[PDB]
C-alpha cells in the first residue's frame, strides 16, 4: 500500500507532459486522498485528477493535475511509461 | 513574433528539469516574464528552437520560485540573441 510508480518515457504534448510530469525523475507517490495508480486513472479517464510526485533531483515533494485521455492521439491515457518503484536508467 | 535565447541552466532547476540545453535553446512560442510569474508552481507549455537540430520541440516547464535560488526558473535568458563567446 506505500507503492511508488517511477515516471519514465513522457510523450509530447501528451497528458502527462501537460501535467508536467518528468522524465525519470519524478515518482507517484499518491493521489492527494484508498486506490492504487492504474485504477485510479482508469475512473479518472476524461477528468482532472490530482497527484503528490516526488523529484529525485529536486529531492522535494509537489502537486501535479492530470487528465488521462485516451483519445489525446497516441498510446494509452497519460502517454508516459510507468515502472514500479524505481528502475535504472543510465543517461548516455 | 518574439524569441527569448536560453543561456546558463543551473544543475537541478527547473529548466534544467524541463530539459532546457544551454546557450543552443530559444523559446520561440506560448511578456515571456509575466508568463513565468503566472505560472508560478504550474507546468507552462513551450515551444523550443534547438540551433544544433535545426528543429522545433515542445518543453514543459513548472517554475518554482522557491527551488532555492534566484527566479524562479534557474536559467539565465536574453532577448533574442546574446553573442556569447566561450574562451
Known amino acids: 500500500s506505500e507503492q511508488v510508480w517511477h515516471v519514465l518515457d513522457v510523450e509530447p504534448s501528451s497528458p502527462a507532459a501537460l501535467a508536467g510530469l518528468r522524465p525519470y525523475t519524478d515518482y507517484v507517490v ?15 479517464e476524461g477528468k482532472p485528477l490530482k497527484l503528490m510526485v516526488y523529484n529525485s533531483k529536486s529531492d522535494s515533494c509537489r502537486e501535479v493535475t492530470v487528465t488521462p485521455n485516451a483519445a489525446w492521439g497516441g498510446e494509452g491515457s497519460l502517454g508516459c511509461g510507468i515502472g514500479y518503484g524505481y528502475l535504472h536508467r543510465i543517461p548516455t
Open 30 to 44: 499518491g493521489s492527494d486522498q484508498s486506490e492504487d495508480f492504474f485504477t485510479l486513472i482508469e475512473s479518472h
